[PDB]
Swiss-Prot record, chains A, B, C:
This is Outer capsid glycoprotein VP7. One of its GO terms (cellular component) is T=13 icosahedral viral capsid. Ca(2+) 2 binds at Q127, D178, V179, D181, D251. Belongs to the rotavirus VP7 family. Disulfide bonds join C32-C85, C115-C199, C141-C194, C146-C157. Glycans are attached at N19. Ca(2+) 1 binds at D45, G156, T164, E166. One of its GO terms (molecular function) is metal ion binding. Transmembrane segments: none annotated. Some rotavirus strains are neuraminidase-sensitive and require sialic acid to attach to the cell surface. Some rotavirus strains are integrin-dependent. Some rotavirus strains depend on ganglioside for their entry into the host cell. Hsp70 also seems to be involved in the entry of some strains. In group A rotaviruses, VP7 defines the G serotype.
Curated annotation (Swiss-Prot), chain D:
Homotrimer. The trimer is coiled-coil stabilized by its C-terminus, however, its N-terminus, known as antigen domain or 'body', seems to be flexible allowing it to self-associate either as a dimer or a trimer. Interacts with host ITGA2 (via ITAG2 I-domain); this interaction occurs when ITGA2 is part of the integrin heterodimer ITGA2/ITGB1. Interacts with host integrin heterodimer ITGA4/ITGB1 and ITGA4/ITGB7. Interacts with host HSPA8/HSP70. This is Outer capsid protein VP5*. It is found in: Virion. Residues 1-233 are annotated as: Spike foot. A motif (KID motif) lies at residues 101-103. It comes from Rotavirus A (strain RVA/Monkey/United States/RRV/1975/G3P5B[3]) (RV-A). Forms the spike 'foot' and 'body' and acts as a membrane permeabilization protein that mediates release of viral particles from endosomal compartments into the cytoplasm. During entry, the part of VP5* that protrudes from the virus folds back on itself and reorganizes from a local dimer to a trimer. This reorganization may be linked to membrane penetration by exposing VP5* hydrophobic region. In integrin-dependent strains, VP5* targets the integrin heterodimer ITGA2/ITGB1 for cell attachment. The lineage of its organism: Viruses, Riboviria, Orthornavirae, Duplornaviricota, Resentoviricetes. It comes from the Viruses. The chain holds residues 535 to 776 of 776 of the full protein.
From Swiss-Prot, chain E:
The N-terminus is blocked. Sumoylated with SUMO1 and SUMO2. Sumoylation of viral proteins seems to have a positive role on viral replication. The keyword Nucleotide-binding does not apply. One of its GO terms (biological process) is fusion of virus membrane with host plasma membrane. This is Intermediate capsid protein VP6. Residues 62-73 are annotated as: Interaction with the inner capsid protein VP2. One of its GO terms (molecular function) is host cell surface receptor binding. It is found in: Virion. The lineage of its organism: Viruses, Riboviria, Orthornavirae, Duplornaviricota, Resentoviricetes.
UniProtKB/Swiss-Prot annotation, chain G:
This is Intermediate capsid protein VP6. Signal peptide: none annotated. The N-terminus is blocked. Sumoylated with SUMO1 and SUMO2. Sumoylation of viral proteins seems to have a positive role on viral replication. It is found in: Virion. The keyword Transport does not apply. Belongs to the rotavirus VP6 family. Ca(2+) binds at N133, D153. Homotrimer. Interacts with the inner capsid protein VP2. Interacts with the outer capsid glycoprotein VP7. Interacts with the outer capsid protein VP5*. The keyword Zinc applies. GO terms for molecular function: host cell surface receptor binding; metal ion binding; structural molecule activity. Its main location: virion. Keywords: Calcium, Capsid protein, Intermediate capsid protein, Metal-binding, Ubl conjugation, Virion, Zinc. It comes from Rotavirus A (strain RVA/Monkey/United States/RRV/1975/G3P5B[3]) (RV-A). GO terms for biological process: fusion of virus membrane with host plasma membrane.
Amino acid sequence: QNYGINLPITGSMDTAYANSTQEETFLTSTLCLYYPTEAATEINDNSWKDTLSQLFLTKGWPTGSVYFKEYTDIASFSVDPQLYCDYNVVLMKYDATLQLDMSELADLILNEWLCNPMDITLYYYQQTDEANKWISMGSSCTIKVCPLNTQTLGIGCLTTDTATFEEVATAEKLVITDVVDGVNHKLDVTTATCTIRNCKKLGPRENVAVIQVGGSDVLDITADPTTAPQTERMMRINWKKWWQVFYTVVDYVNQIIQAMSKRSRSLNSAAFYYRI
Amino acid sequence: QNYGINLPITGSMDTAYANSTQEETFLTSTLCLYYPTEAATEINDNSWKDTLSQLFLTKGWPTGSVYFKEYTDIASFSVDPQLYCDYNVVLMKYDATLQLDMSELADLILNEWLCNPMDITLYYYQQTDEANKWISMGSSCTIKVCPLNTQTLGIGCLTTDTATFEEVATAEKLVITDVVDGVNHKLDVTTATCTIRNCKKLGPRENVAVIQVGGSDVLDITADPTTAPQTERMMRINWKKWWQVFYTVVDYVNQIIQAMSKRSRSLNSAAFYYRI
Amino acid sequence: QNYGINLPITGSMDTAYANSTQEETFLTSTLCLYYPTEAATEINDNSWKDTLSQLFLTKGWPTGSVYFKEYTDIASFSVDPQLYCDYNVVLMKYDATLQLDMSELADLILNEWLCNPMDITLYYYQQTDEANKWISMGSSCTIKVCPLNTQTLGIGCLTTDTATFEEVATAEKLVITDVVDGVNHKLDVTTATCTIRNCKKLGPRENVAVIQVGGSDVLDITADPTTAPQTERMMRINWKKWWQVFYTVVDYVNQIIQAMSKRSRSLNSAAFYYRI
Amino acid sequence: KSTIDAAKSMATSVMKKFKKSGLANSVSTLTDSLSDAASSISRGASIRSVGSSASAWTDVSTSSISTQTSTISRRLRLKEMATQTEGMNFDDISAAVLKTKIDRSTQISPNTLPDIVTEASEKFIPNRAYRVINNDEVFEAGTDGRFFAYRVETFDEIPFDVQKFADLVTDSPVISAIIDFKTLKNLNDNYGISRQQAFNLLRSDPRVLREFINQDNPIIRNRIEQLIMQCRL
Amino acid sequence: MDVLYSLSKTLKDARDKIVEGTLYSNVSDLIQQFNQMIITMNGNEFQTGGIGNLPIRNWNFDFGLLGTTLLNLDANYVETARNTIDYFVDFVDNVCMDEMVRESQRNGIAPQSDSLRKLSGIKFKRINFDNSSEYIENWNLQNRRQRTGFTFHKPNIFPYSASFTLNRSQPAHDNLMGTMWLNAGSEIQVAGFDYSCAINAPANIQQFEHIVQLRRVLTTATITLLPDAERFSFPRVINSADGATTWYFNPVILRPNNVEVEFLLNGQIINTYQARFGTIIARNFDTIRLSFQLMRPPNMTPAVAALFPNAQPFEHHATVGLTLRIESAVCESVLADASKTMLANVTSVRQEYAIPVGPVFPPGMNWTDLITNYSPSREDNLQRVFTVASIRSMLV
Amino acid sequence: NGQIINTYQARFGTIIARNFDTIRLSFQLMRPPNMTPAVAALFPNAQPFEHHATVGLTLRIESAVCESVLADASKTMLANVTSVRQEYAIPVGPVFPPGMNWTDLITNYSPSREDNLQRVFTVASIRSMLV
Amino acid sequence: EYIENWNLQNRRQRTGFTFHKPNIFPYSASFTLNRSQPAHDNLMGTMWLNAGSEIQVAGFDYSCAINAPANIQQFEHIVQLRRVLTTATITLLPDAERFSFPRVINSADGATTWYFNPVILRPNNVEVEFLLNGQIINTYQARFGTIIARNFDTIRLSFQLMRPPNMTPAVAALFPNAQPFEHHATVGLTLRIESAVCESVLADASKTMLANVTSVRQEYAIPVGPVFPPGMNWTDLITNYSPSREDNLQRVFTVASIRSMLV
Amino acid sequence: NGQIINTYQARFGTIIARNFDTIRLSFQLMRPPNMTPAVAALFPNAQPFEHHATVGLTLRIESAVCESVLADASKTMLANVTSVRQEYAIPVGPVFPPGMNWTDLITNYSPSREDNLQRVFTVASIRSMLV
Ligand SMILES: *[C@@H]1O[C@H](CO)[C@@H](O)[C@H](O)[C@H]1NC(C)=O
Ligand SMILES: *[C@@H]1O[C@H](CO)[C@@H](O)[C@H](O)[C@H]1NC(C)=O
Ligand SMILES: [Ca+2]
Ligand SMILES: [Ca+2]
Ligand SMILES: [Ca+2]
Ligand SMILES: [Ca+2]
Ligand SMILES: [Ca+2]
Ligand SMILES: [Ca+2]
Ligand SMILES: [Ca+2]
Ligand SMILES: [Ca+2]
Ligand SMILES: [Ca+2]
Ligand SMILES: [Ca+2]
Ligand SMILES: [Ca+2]
Ligand SMILES: [Ca+2]
Ligand SMILES: [Cl-]
Ligand SMILES: [Zn+2]
Ligand SMILES: [Zn+2]
Ligand SMILES: [Zn+2]
C-alpha cells in the first residue's frame, strides 16, 4: 500500500455493485458496547450480557462477537479510554453539569489523534496549527499556563512564580487545552497525577459511535467556536429505563453500524497514537 | 376514489398557480388548541377563550371555528389523546424530566398508527419490522418483557416466574415499547389499568402540530437512534407569560397552518386506527 | 492520499540509487534502549545516560533523540510492553531457566499482533488458523483450558468442574497459548490479575530489535515446531561487562538500525488499514 | 453439510412443507379442473375459454388479450410440473440456483431447508414466458401481459392470434422462453445467427445456450443474468 | 466504387434532369451518359445477396436506349426512361446493400461483394463519370494517397466514458479529492472536486488534470470551452471504484482557476489556450490536456465561510469544471457525426437483414467499440461501407 | 406501429434507430445495497425524506430521415414561411395554427397540414435559392 | 454561397449568409445585483451566460419576493446583437441549467465571494421580444419550443418570479417571512439560435472558415496585424466587429472557402 | 482490437499467431499440494520468507509479417540509416529521436515517424544495392 498510497484509483460510473472477495484478518467483526455502571445496576441481572449476546445473534452477530465494557462514569472513563472491538458504541449518560467533559470525551474517541510527550519542566510549548491541542488525562489534572512574549517573559504572569499562572483546568480526569497559536507557554501541571501530551487531530474515527442517553444536542467535538458538527456517529435518545435503551441499541444495530465504518480500528486500543 | 387510487395523475409544469386558498381554508376549517391547565391558571381570566376567538376572527377564522381543549399535564393528556378539529395545535410545556414522555406523546400524535389488540395472557408477541411498536396507555402501565428462543424457553427470564422479567415500563401513562424484531416475547402488563396494542406507524399525521413551550429541541419521534428528525410541525418557542404564547400562536396561525396539511383528519378523533 | 485501497506500484529495474538516507533517518528519528535494572546497578554511574547520549551524538543522533528505558527483568517487562520510539532496541539478558518466557517476550515484540477482547465468562473460543493465538498478560496469569466437542461437552474435562481443566499457564506474567484449531475451548483464567486477548499474528514488527546478552540462540518466535527462524532483528552478543555491551550497541548502531525498518503500521500509509 | 441425525428425515422434512405450499395447491387445482372438465358433458360452461375447444389449460376465470395470455401462462407454469415441455424448463434453472445457493450458504440448517426449498420453488423467476411453435409461426406469451407472434427463420412480429395460441398451447409441447422474443430479435439483429442456432434457441436447447455463453455474448448473458437475479426469495 | 458511384449519380441525374418539357440541350450529355450506362450493363448477369436475410436477387439488363434528336423532352420520353431508371435504381440499391454488409481483415478497402467485384472490371470503367461528392473525392484521393480529409459537424470522436479518479480517498469517502468526467461524442465534461476545498493544499490551490487521447488526428477544429461542467454540478450517489459501496457527492461550484487547454500532436504542444473561454481553434492535434485549479476564496462572506470549515465533516464539496465541445473538425479518417447518416445507414442495413457478425466490426455496429479500437483495418472497412452508404443514399 | 424494431440495454454512447415511431424508455432506481455513512444518512428508513432519489435519462436525435417535412436546426424553411407570413400580417387561415406555431403544427400534424406545409416549404426553398 | 455573396457585395447588393448555430454572442458570464449588501445574504439580481448562439439567464431573489409589491419580482435581460440576424429559428426553454446549482461567485470587484443556493421556480409571465432598431419586430408570451425571429438586432427577455400563493409544508419551509434565506428562488431562461441569416460573415458550427484562417495564421506564425485581434480570437473579433474588420474577415473567409474547395 | 484471435493453453514450443497486436500472458503460481521435506522446508507458513516462489514465461518472435517497417536481426536498414546520420553529424530533426535510437522511435511510433522511416529504409535498401 505504502508504495501505492499516492496512486490514482479510477472507477467507472456504471460498474455493477458487487461485494469483496478478499480475506479479512479475523473471520468476523467484533462489537463493543460501553455502558455506565448505573445501567448494569438498574438492569439488576447477572445474565443480561448473555441475553444481549443472544439478541445480537438474532440480529446476525455470531456468538462471540459482542463484548460489553463497563465504566464507572464519564469522568473515570475519560482517563486513557480504550477502544477494543472493530465497532465501538459508547452509551454516554447525559448530565447537564458535565457538558464540557462529555464534549471532551466525544472529541477524544470520535477522532484520530497523534500525540507526543510534553516535558513541561524543561521546555516551553506552542500550538502550531488549529489542529494542535494539549490533551491531558490522569487521576487529577490541574493545568496552569503562562503565555510568554518574544523575549521569553511571561505576559500577565511571572515565569518563576506559578501562583500568577492562568488556570485552564482544575482536577480534571481529561482536558483538551487550546491556547493561542504561535505563543510560547510555560506550563505547570500535576505531573504526579496526570500526563499531558501535544496532540494533533488527524480526522474522524469512523469506528466509534457515541449514543447520548437523554438531554439535548450539547456535544461540541470541534474547538472552533463557529462549528458544532453533528456527525452520523453521535446519536441521541430519550430514556426512562435502561432495558429499553439496550433493546433500542440491539434492534437498530444495523443502522448504528451503517453510520460507522470498519478499517479504522488501530492495532492498539488507545484513543490516540503516540510518538516519543 | 379507491378505484382511482392506483392510477397516475399527470400535470404539466406550466399550469397557472391558483389564488391563495388560506381564506377559504380558514372559512371551511376548524382549529383546536390544546393547552395545559397552568396556562389557564396563569391567565386567570374567564373570557380569555372569547378574546382568542375574536382575535382569530381578526385573523380570518369564522367565529365558531376555534376550539380550546385543556389537559392537566403531558402524562394525563397521553392517555387516549383525542384530536377533534381539522387543525390541531398542541401547546406542550417543556420539562427536562419528562423528555421521553414528551417524545412519546409527540410520536403518538404527530404520526398515524394502525393498532391491533394484544392478548398478552394467551399469545407470545413479536415486532415484525422497524415500523412495529407496542403502544401502552392507561392509568398505570407497567410493562415487563421476557424474550424467548426458538424452543420457546426464556432467556434471562422464566415464563412461569414474572419476577425475573425484564421490566421496561413502570407507572407510565403512555409508553411506546420497542423490542428486538423477530424475537417472541412474553409480556406482563397491568391489564387492569393498562391497555397495550400492537401498532404500526403508517406515516406522518400532517394535521397535528406541536409547539414546545420552553427548553431545547429534545423531541425524538423516531425510535431509530440514528435519526431525530425535526419536522415542520415541531415548533419550539421561548416564553415568560402564557398570554404572549397565545398571542404568538394567534398572530402566526397562518404559518402554523401552512406547516400542516388538511385531509389528514380521521373520521374518529382517536390518535390511532384500531383494527380487530 | 488513497488510504483504504492497496494499489500496485510499478518501477523500472535500472532507474538509479538515491543518496544515503541514514544521516537523515538518524536526525529525524528517535531511538529507545530497553535494558535490565541489573545493568544500571553494575554500571554504577549516575550520569551514564548522559555519556551514552554524547556517544550517540558522535554517531550522528541529535541530543534528546536517544531514550533509555529500564525494566526490572524479563518477567516484569513482559507485562504489556510499550515500545513507542521510532527505533526500539531491547537488551534482553539470557537466563537458561527463562527460555520460553524470553521467546514469548520476543514473540510479542518482534511481531505485529492484532488483538480482540476475550470474555471467558460468556463465550467459548476457538483458534481459527495458525496465526491465531491467545496472549494473556498480567500480574499472574493462570490459564486452564477444557476442550469441547461438537456436542459442547468437554473432552477429558467437565465444563462445570474447573478442577478437571487442563492447566496450560501458571502464574505467568505473559503467556502465548496455542491450542488445536477448530475446537471450542472453555477457559478458566484469573481475570482479576490477568487479561487474555484473542490475537492474530499479522507479520513482523520492523522497528523492534532484541539483542540477547549471554547464552546461545534459544529464541523461537514461531509456534510451529518445524521452524525456528532467526531474523536479522534477533541479535546475540557474548558479554562480561555492561559498559562493554552499551559501547558495542553505540558503536554498531548503524548496523542495528540497518537491520530494522520503520514500522509499516505506524506511518501515514497505513491509514485506514489498521492504524495511521 | 449433513448434520447427522437431521439427514435421517431431510428429504421427508422438506417434502412435508412442500406439499402444503402454493405450487402443490396449484398442481392439485389443475388436476381437479382437468378431472371435472373430463367428467362434464354440460358442466363445462363454467370454463371460460378462448380456444375453439373448452380446456382446463385455457381456462381464464380471473388489454383483454394481455389479461387472457397472462391468465393462460400463469397456469402454463404447471406444464413445467407436468413433463409437457421440451425446452430447458425454467424450473430446472431455479433448481440449479437453489442447489448452488444451499451448497454455498454458510447459514442453511436442516430445520430451515424445509420451506426454503418451497419458497424458492414458488418465488424463483416469478414472471416467466412460454412459446409454442407451429408450422413456422411462434406464439409467445408471458405472465406479465406481453404476447408476441413471429416467424422462425426471421423473427418478424405478426398480429397475435389468440384462440390459436390457446389451442396450440393446450396440446402442443410448450417451450420455456428462456431467451425471450426481445432477446431473440436483439441477437438476430446485432449477432445474426444461423438457421440451426435460431432453431435451437427457440426450442431452448441447452447446447446453443452454453455455446453463446462461452462466446461471451452480451445479449444472452444479460438475459441469463436477469433470470438469475430474478431467482430471489 | 467509382463505377458504382457513377451508376448512382447517373440515375440521380436521370431522375432530376430527364423531365417533361426540358430542352434536349439540357440533357444531351446526361442522355449520352445514360445510354453509355445502358450499353455497358446490357448483356451482363448480376447476383446480389446471400448473406444474412438479404435475399438472392438476379439482375439482367436488356434495356433500350434513349432518343437523341428531339428538341424538347415530352411525357413519352420520360415514360420510356422511367422504367429503366426504376430497374437500375433497384439494382444499385441492392448492390450497395450487398457491399455494406461485408468486411475483410486483409483488404477492407477492396470490393467484397461479387457484384461490386465484377463492376471493378475494366469494361465497366466506361460508366465512370463525374466524381464530385465529398466521400467519392476522398476515396479517389486516398487511393492515389493524396492528403485529403472529411469535414465533420460535431464529430463522434470520443467513445462513451463516464468515469472518476480519486487522488485522495478513504473507506468512508468523506474527504475525497479527484476528477469525474464524461467523454461522449464531441463533448468532454470534466470536474475536479475537493471535499476539503483545498484548506490544507499548498497555496490553497488544488490542481486537476484531464488527458484525452483521440484515436485519430483532428485538424482545423472549432472548440467551445465553458468554465462549468453542468453534468457534475448536482448531488450524486456514486458507486465506489470496485462497486463495494457508494459515496456521496454534494458539489458547490467554484469557478475554475488557471485554466489551460493544450492541444497536442505526438506529444508536441500545437495549441495552448490559457483562461480563454468561448470559441478556440485547434489546428492539428490528437490529444487534449485540460489543466485547471481550485483556489480557496481568500475572502469569504459569512455563508461562504460557513460552507468550508477548517476540518471535517465536509458537507459541501468544492468543485471546478470545464466543458469542451468540438463544433466542427476535419479528419483524414471517416467518423460518425451529427450531420451525416452513413453510420445509421450501415447499421440499419446490417440489422434489417440479420448480417452475421464479421471479424472486423463490433456486433451491432456499435460505435463506442468501433471508435475505441479504430484500427487501420477497421478504418479501411468503415471507409468502404460509408462510401457505399453515401452512394446508396444518393438514390435511397 | 407497436412492433419492436430496435432495443438497446445499458448502452449510452450512440445508437441507431433504423425505423420507429415510438420510444419506450425504461429505467430502474435501485437502492444501493452498500452505503457509506453519508449516503446512508441521506436515505432514512421512514419519513421525512429530505433527499429524494432520482434517476435520469437524456435522448437526443442528432439526425434522422422522415418521409414528411419537418422543422430542423439546419434548414430555414419554417423560418422563411413564418417570416413571410408575419411581415405581411397574413390572417390566420383554416389549416395552420395562428402564427405558424410549430408546437401546434406538430401536435396535430394532419395529412392536410402535411400537404400544405410541404407545399409552402418547397416554395420557401425555391425562394431562398434567389433571396 | 461565399463567392456569390462576394459578387453581391462588390455590386453593393443585399448579401445573405445562412448559419447553423451562428457564433453571434461573444463569451460573457456576468451577473447584476439589483439588491445587495456586504453580507450578500439577501440578494436580488440576474446572472447570465452568452456564448455562441446560446443565452442562458437566471433571475434570482433570495427573499423569494416575500416583500415584493404583489409577490412578483420582475427580471429583465437585454442582449444587443452586433449584427442584424434575419429568418432565425430559436429554441426557447424555461429553465437555465447553467445557473440552477449551488455556486460560490466572486463579488463584483473581487473583494469577496457570495453564496448562491438556487431553488428553481418556473418563470412567470415570460416575454421574449426581438427588436430591430428599437422597434418591436417579434413578441412571444408564455411560448416555449421553436419560435421565429424574422428580423432583429436586440433580444429582450422579461420574466417574473411569482411567489407560490399556496405552498406545501416542505415548500413553505424554504421561504420564511424574513432572513436568513438559506434557499434562494430562481427563474431561468434558455435561448438557442439554431439557425439564422446575416448580411455579414460569422463563425458558426457547420462551417470551417474561421478555423481554416486561424490555423493558417498559427501554422506559419504570422505576426499580429493592425486589424484582427491576436490569435484571431472570435470573442474579441465580434465584440468590436467594425466595418474594417468585416471587410477583412469576409475577404479571408472567402479565400478560406476557395482553398477548402481543394484542400 | 481486444478480440481473442489466438489462444494457447499449456502449449509450449512453436505456436502461430496469425494476426494480433496485443499479447496477454496469464500464468499462476500454485502451491505444491504435496511437498518433499526439503520443498516443505523452503516454504513456511509465515514470515520470514527466505526462498521466494517464482513462475516464469519466455516468448520469442522467431519471425513475423508487419505492414509497417521495423528493425529486425537480419536486415541492416536501421544500421545503415543510423550510420549515415552519425558519420555526417546530422542535426536532430523534428521527427526521429536524437540518436536514431530504436527504443524511443518504436515507443512513440507515430504515423509521421512511420512514413519517414519507410522512406529512409527504402532509400537505405536502394543504397545497399550498390554500397
Ligand atoms: C384570483 O385573483 C385575481 C387577482 O386579484 C382575481 O382577479 C380573480 O378574480 C381571483 N379569483 C379567481 C377565481 O381567479
Ligand atoms: C547526492 O549526492 C551527490 C554526491 O555527493 C551530490 O552531488 C548531490 O547533490 C546529492 N543530492 C542529490 C539530490 O543528488
Ligand atoms: Ca474535563
Ligand atoms: Ca496572572
Ligand atoms: Ca491553539
Ligand atoms: Ca465548536
Ligand atoms: Ca411515558
Ligand atoms: Ca431477568
Ligand atoms: Ca422493534
Ligand atoms: Ca430517534
Ligand atoms: Ca511466560
Ligand atoms: Ca481433566
Ligand atoms: Ca491453534
Ligand atoms: Ca518454532
Ligand atoms: Cl448542433
Ligand atoms: Zn448542429
Ligand atoms: Zn472509492
Ligand atoms: Zn457583490
